[PDB]
Write a protein that binds this ligand. Structure first.
Ligand code: HEM
Length: 153
């Protein structure tokens, strides 16, 4: 639902994530978890992390943050025409991971805050609004897939 110009602003700021996927991923998860503690309960592998210092040392957290943004990236790059990339994610998150649409809103917030915290200079008003739209489109399509699979959108 983005203009070609909005996609270009998205992909340009995503270029900065691609220069350090894992560090960005780590910081999004830690923002997510510190901001919304209940989200951490969906990760059996990350219970034992009782502080931001434990989260920061966790090599598995960092790997997972890398896996997560690499997938998000694959989606963003398709600029809307992302059905093939989006389905497997909606499938696994609607079924095996039991991730509610609302949590998708929290991680979208955390993504924006990380971008804003690491790249304040490049993440101006126009880039912010385009990234918000792109994440909103991702959330909306995930929710439409969940409802088609028989789950809550
Ligand atoms: C930008 C949104 C998200 C993206 C792109 C994303 C991506 C991924 C990917 C690529 C995987 C690995 C393959 C799979 O199982 O599908 C995964 C696994 C997983 N995701 Fe997500 N995810 C997102 C949001 C979330 C949120 C918000 C939660 C919890 C609140 C979550 C919980 C999980 C869990 C629990 C797993 C399995 C982890 C394990 O190996 O123990 N995801 N995610």
């Amino acid at each position: 639902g983005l203009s070609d110009g909005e996609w270009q602003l998205v992909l340009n700021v995503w270029g900065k994530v691609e220069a350090d996927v894992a560090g960005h991923g780590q910081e999004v998860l830690i923002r997510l978890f510190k901001g919304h503690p209940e989200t951490l309960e969906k990760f059996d592998k990350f219970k034992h992390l009782k502080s931001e210092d434990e989260m920061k040392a966790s090599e598995d957290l960092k790997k997972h943050g890398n896996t997560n943004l690499t997938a998000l990236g694959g989606i963003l790059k398709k600029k809307g025409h992302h059905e093939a990339e989006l389905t497997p994610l909606a499938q696994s998150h609607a079924t095996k991971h039991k991730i509610p649409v609302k949590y998708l809103e929290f991680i979208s917030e955390a993504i924006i805050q990380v971008l804003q915290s690491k790249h304040p200079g490049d993440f101006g008003a126009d880039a912010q609004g385009a990234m918000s739209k792109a994440l909103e489109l991702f959330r909306n399509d995930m929710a439409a897939k969940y409802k088609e699979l028989g789950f809550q959108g």
